[PDB]
DNA sequence: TTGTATACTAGCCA
DNA sequence: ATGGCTAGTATACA
DNA sequence: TTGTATACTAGCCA
DNA sequence: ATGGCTAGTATACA
């Protein structure tokens, strides 16, 4: 197991003490949305006030671990995003609401509403001096698109010559079960977006915390990009998968 | 103007009393977001708790105007979306969060955050039997794409033959200044979006309300598709532009 | 091919 | 407890 | 070219 | 109070 990367088969809400206050530059949180999924446990079986209470509980434990320059990304569903973001705006300051456009809509069979195709990500910061580096995550143009975008007014601009801001909508397709990156986990997140977070909001060598790491996608991002990692996952199968994913680099 | 198209150059909060309760089938609300724009007035000059108080004010005026079958779309910025939606969930039930992907990001020059390219839209309903008709808003495939999506298992499915759900992310570019649609209004909304909303959530001939109609995009949307319209705008020039836009269809 | 505006600059330093 | 200066910001319409 | 799974049906009726 | 049954749900991986 590489150095700096640290995986625990433990519940975060109980081991939070083992984590020094103000030791983490970035929290990458993909917690249970409150949607009834089966992680081999009932963590995503909560809902309503129950789920939101649990959310704010683990959040109150996690926040004090952020150093003053720290930041946080938190995934959730629109069904609970208003309440969650409202609570977090009392503690931290919201820098962005990033929309993950999964490209592939949820199934079921409804015709009474619009089908789900996005997840919500709150991007919060402790203080106004939060760390943020755009250059590693700039998206470079290809020959054709740069040609289509180039104008003398824009020539030499950083966004045109180096690459543009990924913007607060990320259109990255969800991972097909047969996708090469896919592992046996119900709600695995594309490494693309997690790497974007690690790169833009964690300095090289900084420490990232994933209190609900699942298959360890954030562990992989940190390993590939030279960041330190800490992760918690109550399911040992997912934890072993994370070990595997990391050691294969 | 056509038949069921009522354009009132009146402040909505003083004139909502005139509109009968349980009169409106759909509310298409694009209120000021609280970002500091200039509509010839200080409506968007509010911010923070004072802006959220004014939002609650006009919302409390507008909700009772909904028939038990009615619905509401509300445009907002991620900056005030959590509080506004949190408050609306206590008055109505949320059916969707629609993300308008504007394709063109906001300018400025920042480097210390991700650039704004999406507006938030809350889709709420009074009761669990709200009126929703997906067929008129379905998006049919072209030939090549229908060939790429067809499979024996899918053949005959309504989504493959008639059209697929727009989903809760609508990718539609903002109206360029020189765009045909565009008029002299700072925050004009694409007719595609507004029309999708009107067609999916207002019964033909029903009444839709626009507390702040601006250029009357919703007015056009209802004129075509044959729906009734009541809109309010305090700017006489915006009301003028709306009058023109409506008296140019057919 | 190209000009150009579109709901959502910000950190210093004074 | 405010400004102003700087380096900086994409797409798609006509 | 084709099979196939993917964080988020929903109303009725025995 | 509880299944089961219905009509029904898009893309992009391999
Ligand atoms: N108290 C808890 N402590 C640690 N893990 C938990 C806890 N509660 C739920 N979990 C796990 O958190 C994970 C949430 C997942 N969304 C993580 C997915 C992860 N982003 C991935 O790419 O694989 C699940 O695997 C849960 O089993
Ligand atoms: N009390 C008020 N009553 C009526 N209109 C108002 C009021 N306050 C602000 N407005 C107007 O609300 C409008 C908000 C706009 N975003 C509407 C845009 C509109 N959807 C369009 O396509 O043009 C502005 O034009 C304001 O002039
Ligand atoms: O959490 C930041 C978030 O709050 C908003 C409105 O909800 O602004 C509020 O908080 C700001 C903190 O920087 C204050 O400056 C502002 O006065 C207050 O309204 C959003 O602007 C912002 O995204």
- Secondary-structure breakdown of chain B: helix, strand, coil percentages, each rounded to the nearest 5: 30, 20, 50
CA separation for the pair A107, A117 (Å, rounded): 10
CA separation for the pair A243, A214 (Å, rounded): 11
Q: Strand locations in B111-233, DSSP E?
A: 118-125, 169-171, 207-210, 228-232
Residues B229, B219 contacting (CB under 8 angstroms): yes
Name the residue facing B165 among A95, A114, A165 (closest C-beta).
Answer: A114
**Listed resolution, Å:** 2.2
Instruction: Check residues 166 to 185 of chain B and report those whose beta carbon is under 7 Å from nucleic acid strand C.
Output: 174-178
| CB neighbourhood size of A237 (10 A) | 14
CA separation for the pair A96, A197 (Å, rounded): 12
CA separation for the pair A211, A160 (Å, rounded): 37
Residues B73, B24 contacting (CB under 8 angstroms): no
Q: Chain B residue with minimal CA distance to A79? A: B94
Q: Do A112 and B132 touch (CB under 8 A)?
A: yes
CA separation for the pair B71, A18 (Å, rounded): 49
Longest dimension (CA), chain B: 59
CA separation for the pair A21, A54 (Å, rounded): 20
Q: Which two tokens stand for residue B61?
A: 């005026």
B79 part of contact set with chain A, CB < 8 Å:
yes
Instruction: Read off φ and ψ for residue A233, nearest 5 degrees.
Output: -155, 125
Residue B161's SS3 state is: helix
Gap from A43 CA to C1 C1', Å: 57
Residues B169, B102 contacting (CB under 8 angstroms): no
Q: Strand locations in A110-191, DSSP E?
A: 118-125, 169-171
For tokens 């801001």, the residue is A165
Ligand 3 centre from A89 Cα, in Å? 8
A173-205 burial, b for 16+ CB within 10 Å, e for fewer? ebbeeeeeeebebebbbbbebbbbbbbbbbeee
Residues A208, A218 contacting (CB under 8 angstroms): yes
- Judge if the beta carbon of A78 is closer than 7 A to nucleic acid strand E: yes
- Give, as ranges, the nucleotides of chain E with any atom within 7 Å of a protein CB: 2-11
- What method was applied to determine this entry? X-ray
- Give, as ranges, the nucleotides of chain D with any atom within 7 Å of a protein CB: 7-14
Domains located in chain B, CATH noted = 5-138+167-246 (3.40.50.150)
DSSP conformation class of A141: P
Q: Tell me the CA distances in angstroms from B195 to A113, B6, B174, B214, B217, one per residue in order.
A: 16, 18, 15, 15, 9
CA separation for the pair B205, B245 (Å, rounded): 20
B175-212 burial, b for 16+ CB within 10 Å, e for fewer? beeeeeeebebebbbbbebbbbbbbbbbeeebbbbbbb
Ligand 2 atom closest to the Cα of residue B31 is 14
Phi-psi region of B233 (alpha: psi -120 to 50; beta: other; left: phi over 0): beta
Q: Tell me the CA distances in angstroms from A105 to A140, A205, B2, B200, B201, one per residue in order.
A: 28, 37, 39, 19, 21
Residue B219's SS3 state is: helix
Q: Residue B11: CB within 6 Å of ligand 2?
A: yes
Q: How do strand B118-125 and strand B66-76 relate by DSSP bridges?
A: antiparallel
- Judge if the beta carbon of A78 is closer than 7 A to nucleic acid strand C: no
CA separation for the pair A188, A6 (Å, rounded): 19
Q: Tell me the CA distances in angstroms from A216 to A175, A180, B242, one per residue in order.
A: 15, 15, 54
- Enumerate residues preceding breaks in chain B (C to N > 2.5 Å): none
Q: Which helix (H) or strand (E) holds B68?
A: strand B66-76
Residues A69, A127 contacting (CB under 8 angstroms): yes
Q: Which residues contact A91 (CB under 8 A, 6 or more apart)?
A: A59, A60, A63
CA separation for the pair B92, B17 (Å, rounded): 21
Question: Closest nt to B164 (CA→C1')?
Answer: F10
Could you identify the residue whose CA is nearest to the C1' atom of nucleotide D7? B109
Length of chain B measured in residues: 250
Secondary structure (DSSP) of chain B: --SSEEEE-S-HHHHGGGSPTT-EEEEEE----SS---SSSSSTT--HHHHHHHHHHHHHHHGGGEEEEEEEEEEE-TTTHHHHHHHHHHHSEEEEEEEEE-SSPP-S---SSPPP-EEEEEEEESSTT-----GGG-B---HHHHHHH--TTTTT-HHHHT-B---SEEE-----TTSSS--S-TT---HHHHHHHHHHHS-TT-EEEETT-TTTHHHHHHHTTT-EEEEE-S-HHHHHHHHHHHTT--
**Nearest one of A240, A191, A241 to A217, comparing CA atoms:** A191
Q: How do strand B228-232 and strand A207-210 relate by DSSP bridges?
A: unpaired
Residues A189, A170 contacting (CB under 8 angstroms): no
Name the residue facing A113 among B96, B105, B116 (closest C-beta).
Answer: B96
Q: Residue B234: CB within 6 Å of ligand 2?
A: yes
Residues A93, A128 contacting (CB under 8 angstroms): yes
* Relative orientation angle of helices A81-91 and A48-62, to the nearest 10 degrees: 30
Q: Give the closest residue (by CA) to ligand 2 atom 3.
A: B11
Work out the end-to-end distance of chain A between its first and last CA atoms, rounded to an integer number of angstroms: 11
Name the residue facing A117 among B84, B115, B169 (closest C-beta).
Answer: B169
């Amino acid at each position: 197991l590489p150095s700096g990367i640290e995986l625990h088969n433990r519940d975060f809400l109980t081991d939070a003490a083992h984590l020094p206050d103000a030791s983490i530059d970035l929290i990458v949180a993909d917690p249970p949305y409150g949607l009834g999924k089966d992680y081999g446990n009932d963590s995503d079986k909560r809902s309503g006030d129950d789920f939101l209470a649990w959310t704010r509980e683990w959040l109150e434990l996690a926040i004090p671990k952020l150093k003053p320059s720290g930041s946080m990304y938190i995934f959730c569903t629109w069904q609970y995003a208003p309440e969650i973001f409202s609570f977090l705006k009392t503690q931290l300051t919201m820098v962005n609401e990033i929309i993950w456009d999964r490209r592939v809509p949820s199934m079921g069979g409804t015709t009474r509403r619009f089908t789900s195709v996005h997840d919500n990500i709150g991007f919060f910061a402790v203080s106004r001096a939060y760390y943020f580096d755009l250059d590693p995550v700039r998206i470079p143009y290809d020959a054709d698109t740069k040609k289509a975008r180039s104008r003398k007014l824009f020539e030499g601009s950083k966004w045109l010559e180096m690459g543009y801001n990924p913007k607060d909508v990320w259109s990255v397709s969800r991972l097909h079960r047969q996708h090469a990156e896919r592992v046996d986990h119900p709600t695995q997140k594309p490494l693309e977006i997690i790497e974007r977070m690690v790169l833009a909001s964690c300095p090289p060598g900084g420490r990232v915390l994933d209190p609900f790491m699942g298959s360890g996608t954030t562990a992989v991002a940190c390993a590939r990009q030279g960041r330190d990692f800490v992760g918690y996952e109550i399911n040992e199968s997912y934890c072993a998968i994370a070990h595997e994913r990391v050691n294969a680099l």
